[PDB]
Amino acid sequence: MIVFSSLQIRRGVRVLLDNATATINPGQKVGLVGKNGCGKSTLLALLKNEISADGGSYTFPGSWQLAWVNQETPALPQAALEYVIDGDREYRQLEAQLHDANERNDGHAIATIHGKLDAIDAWSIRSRAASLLHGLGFSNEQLERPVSDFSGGWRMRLNLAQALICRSDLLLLDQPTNHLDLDAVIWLEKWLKSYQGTLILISHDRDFLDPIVDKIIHIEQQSMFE
C-alpha cells in the first residue's frame, strides 16, 4: 500500500531519480536491485524519514512500525544486551523522559511514565532479548561482552537480532547476509519466508534472493522499473 509517485530525489549536486513511480502492495516481499552508488540506501533512508523527498510524496500508511537494519556497524563499547535492547525503541525514549522526571521531581510524570512502561512488557525486555539472542547462537557469557570485538559474522547477528525485538510491520533489510555463514543464512531465510509483515530487501546475492522475494524494483537510469 506504499506508493512513490514522481519521486525526484537529489543528493546535493547530484540527482538520483529524475521522476519515477512505483507501488508496493501490503504483504509482499520486495527486492531492490541497482548499481554501486545508485540510491538504494537513499530510498531506505527516505522511508526511514530522515532525508527530504524534494517533491515526491512517498506517502505510506502512517499507522505502521518500522524495523530497519543499516549498512555500517561501528565499534561500540555497549554490551551485546544493551545493543540488542536499544533496537526496541519507545523504551529508550520512555526511560529518557523517566530519567528527566526523576531528576526534575515531576510526580505526575513519574506515574505517567511508569504506566506507559507497564503498558508494554517492559520489565521482561532483558528476558525477551536473551531468548531471541539464544536462537542466533550465543550462550550466556557473551551477553555482557562488548560488541566492540564479537568477530565479524557475530556482530552481523547482533545487529540483525536488533531488528527482531519489536514486532514491526515494515522490515527494511539492507544487505543482511554480508558476513553470515551458510549456517545462519538458512535460518534467516526460514524466518523471512514465514514473515508476515511487509519486507523490503537490498542484496546482490541471486541465490539468496531467489526464494523469498515476490517482485523487484530496479533503479537503472534515474528511474525505477518494477
Partner: protein, 50 residues
C-alpha cells in the same frame, strides 16, 4: 533552461511566500533569506521550500 522554480515561505506562521528561481545543480543548499511579511508587517526569515 536549467533554473528551477522555488517558493520561500515565511517562518512567522502565516501562509505568505515569495516565488523565485534557483539553480539546483550548482548551489547545493536551501535559501535562508529575510524579507518583509505584509501579513504581520515585520521583517522575518524566509526559507526555501516546495
Amino acid at each position: 533552461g536549467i533554473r528551477e522554480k522555488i517558493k520561500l515561505v515565511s517562518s512567522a506562521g502565516t501562509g505568505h511566500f515569495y516565488t523565485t528561481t534557483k539553480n539546483k545543480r550548482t548551489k547545493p543548499e536551501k535559501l535562508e533569506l529575510k524579507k518583509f511579511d505584509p501579513v504581520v508587517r515585520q521583517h522575518v526569515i524566509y526559507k526555501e521550500a516546495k
